[PDB]
């Protein structure tokens, strides 16, 4: 009589790597590197905002493209390719820092600056470049200040905004650099133009320069609770009508992929979502959110069983 001890096996086993052996056969194994991506942004459980044609900077200054996105709250913000920040030609100083700061936020609210100007200032100047409601308009949160009577000197004006909130506010402004000397004199007169912005945490001076629409370069800063920021100008300033408060935190995603409210994900990239449970990932080094780690590896099989010894 006999009793024999033994172990199971399978006909078709799986190859794994060990410390010792490249080609070790085992009864079962499982993948640790995810290779597939969903070609969409999985937005289930997320109060998201798809900006579409609106560029994040554009919702602070207020281009026509961003009229639906001037305020709101979100936990996720999606930026698309070729989104419009500027109707009238321009460039923001520290463009990328401002974009990323907006794309880290979980909302925007707008606060009136309350700025008032004398009778010799026309504040309602528009342009055919910023079209809204099939008519000439301008950036919704700014005002182009000009001399009311064409040719006259713009008066030395002082406008000061105080932050009365318990949170910091983001304030923007433009500086019109005229194209020719004729335009400069028609808009602001023949005087020396001197624009001066200043607070506790910020101070700068801007002198417009001469030399087919012209430029408007944008600037920005944060204004801390209880602090004032003061604009001293005599022509050239594109003054704010409202300031912005960035509310809480959120996840900025840059992707052309469509939104799907049926799937959930915590990790995103340019080409969509990566909602695997696996620890590793070979799809992209550029991701955001809570992600598996990128590895230069096609497959990596963890063994879930003994050696397979068939016969």
């Amino acid at each position: 009589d006999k009793i024999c001890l033994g172990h199971h096996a399978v006909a078709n086993g799986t190859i794994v790597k060990t410390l010792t052996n490249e080609q070790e056969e085992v009864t079962n194994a499982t993948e640790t590197v995810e290779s597939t991506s969903l070609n969409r942004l999985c937005m289930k459980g997320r109060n998201h905002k798809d900006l579409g044609n609106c560029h994040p900077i554009g919702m602070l200054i207020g281009t026509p493209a961003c009229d639906l996105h001037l305020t709101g709250t979100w936990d996720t913000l999606i930026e698309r390719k070729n989104a419009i920040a500027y109707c009238y030609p321009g460039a923001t100083v520290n463009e990328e820092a401002l974009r990323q700061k907006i794309m880290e936020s979980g909302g925007i609210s707008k606060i009136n600056t309350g700025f008032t100007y004398g009778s010799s200032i026309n504040s309602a100047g528009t342009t055919k470049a910023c079209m809204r409601n099939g008519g000439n308009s301008f950036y919704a949160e700014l005002k182009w200040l000009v001399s009311k009577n064409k040719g006259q000197n713009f008066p030395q004006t002082t406008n000061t905004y105080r932050n009365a909130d318990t949170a910091e506010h983001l304030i923007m402004w433009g500086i019109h650099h005229p194209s020719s000397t004729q335009e400069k004199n028609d808009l602001y007169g023949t005087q020396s133009l001197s624009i001066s912005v200043g607070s506790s945490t910020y101070k700068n001076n801007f002198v417009p320069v001469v030399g087919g629409l012209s430029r408007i370069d944008f600037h920005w800063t944060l204004v801390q609770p209880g602090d004032k920021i003061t604009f001293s100008h005599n022509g050239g300033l594109i003054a704010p009508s409202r300031v912005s408060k960035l509310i809480g935190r959120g996840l900025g995603i840059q992707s052309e992929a469509p939104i799907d409210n049926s799937c959930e994900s915590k990790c995103f990239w340019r080409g969509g979502s990566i909602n695997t449970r696996l620890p590793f990932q070979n799809l992209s080094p550029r991701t955001v959110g809570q992600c598996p780690k990128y590895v230069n590896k096609k497959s990596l099989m963890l063994a879930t069983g003994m050696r397979n010894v068939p016969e």
């Binding site: 001890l5 900025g252 780690k293 050696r307």
Partner: protein, 172 residues
């Protein structure tokens, strides 16, 4: 392997064994049979489950964009970002390779060890009523019916009962 049983003194596995990882095959006057050992099987599965619970997991650290997809980044800070990202990736690629190679080696030897621990508790149960054949079997020197074979598997085989009969057959 490390513990000498699986791909060792056991010549091969049993494809017919589908209700367990480790088990018994007997033969006596009544015929033959097969049965899976629950505890050794479950001991090996539980350790792999625990191994999977640790490894199939990601960090809950929220990362954000430091490279714009849709615009040019500064050439200085971009080469720094690329070099950093590539350095991190080589570390994780290395760390993942080593993790799985190490875990795989341990898994194999761990399962090898539970086969041996099953074989060893049987040897000690049988005591002087049987002898090892070198292939994983125990030649039992007494009539051991289906109810006797059950008690070896159930861990209630009393060697005292069959000791006198067995010692005589061994010496002959």
């Amino acid at each position: 392997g490390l513990f000498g049983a699986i791909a060792g003194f056991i010549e091969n596995g049993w494809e017919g064994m589908v209700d367990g990882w480790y088990g018994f095959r007997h033969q006596n006057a009544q015929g033959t049979g097969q049965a899976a050992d629950y505890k050794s099987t479950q001991a090996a599965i539980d350790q792999i489950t625990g191994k999977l619970n640790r490894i199939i997991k990601k960090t809950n650290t929220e990362f954000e964009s430091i490279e714009s997809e849709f615009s040019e980044i500064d050439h200085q800070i971009g080469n720094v970002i690329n070099w950093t990202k590539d350095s991190i990736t080589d570390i994780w690629t290395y760390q993942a390779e080593l993790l799985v190679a190490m875990e795989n080696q341990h898994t194999i030897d761990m399962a090898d060890s539970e086969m041996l621990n099953l074989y060893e508790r049987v040897r000690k149960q049988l005591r002087q009523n049987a002898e090892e054949d070198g292939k994983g079997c125990f030649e039992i020197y007494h009539a051991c019916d289906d109810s006797c074979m059950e008690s070896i598997r159930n861990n209630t085989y009393d060697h005292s009962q069959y000791r006198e009969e067995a010692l005589l057959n061994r010496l002959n």
